[PDB]
Design a protein around this ligand. Structure first.
Ligand code: A1LYT
Ligand code: A1LYT
Lengths: 133, 134
């Protein structure tokens, strides 16, 4: 399935395309039922727990929009995907105010179906405070 | 010379041993003079610029103390070191208030002398605001 860095990067792109849509009914297309997720101090086990965690943060930030880009992905001999890129966010209240930070995603895939079973996203959230005027 | 993940991880531990001492005269033992560093929106080119960036940031937080641990390191076929661990910080004024966040370091080494020529550190700094409060 995923054999090259380019295919890994395209998969990560597809994953964030789903995630940034906030269409939770599709998250299971790409995330395993027992997903282990860490995002700084946010940590969840299982797909429903992942979805509930995002929903909570999203109610906290109404009007939130996010997007992601990638520029450097490796696919290692252990099967790990390391993907460096950037994370963008804006608030619908002032959508022209965009905050962008570097990010890296660490992914391990399910050997059976190729879904993400471990996802650890690293980025500095402090700059997103600038979304509040 | 680094050929295994365990040696990669042991080297990263020593690197942060030097960095967390804030003894800037030693940074060149492990960092190349043309080091390319990115730490969130912090970005520097050259060792002197890296050092000045840290010095500026430390002036903002007197009494800062830091340490690091590691748990999962890979050394790839491209020579890249990816090292996941944690970043701890406290203030000397209140040393028992510790804030710890996950972190990962991305490193490329100088083929000549084995020093770090690229270092990109990723972590959420927002929790460290709790070091001002109480
Ligand atoms: C302030 C930032 C921009 C923020 C996110 C975060 O930093 O946790 C969340 C809580 C979740 C992100 C997800 C995680 C897995 C990020 O990669 C994917 C996209 C978005 C739903 C949404 C906005
Ligand atoms: C608030 C946080 C904890 C903080 C750091 C940071 O987040 O930039 C700096 C500015 C620099 C770090 C260095 C960079 C390369 C971090 O990895 C190494 C250790 C410390 C000297 C010091 C404390």
């Amino acid at each position: 399935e995923i054999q090259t860095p380019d295919q890994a990067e395209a998969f990560v792109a597809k994953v964030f395309d789903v995630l940034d849509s906030y269409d939770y009914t599709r998250f299971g297309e790409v995330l395993s039922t027992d997903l282990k997720y860490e995002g700084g101090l946010q940590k969840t086990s299982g797909l429903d727990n992942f979805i509930n965690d995002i929903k909570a943060s999203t109610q906290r930030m109404p009007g939130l929009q996010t997007s992601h880009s990638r520029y450097r992905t490796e696919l290692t001999a252990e099967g790990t995907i390391y993907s460096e890129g950037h994370s963008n966010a804006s608030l619908e209240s002032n959508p022209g105010k965009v905050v962008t930070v570097p990010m890296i995603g660490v992914f391990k895939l399910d050997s059976e179906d190729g879904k993400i079973k471990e996802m650890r996203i690293y980025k500095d959230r402090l700059p997103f405070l600038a979304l509040h005027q």
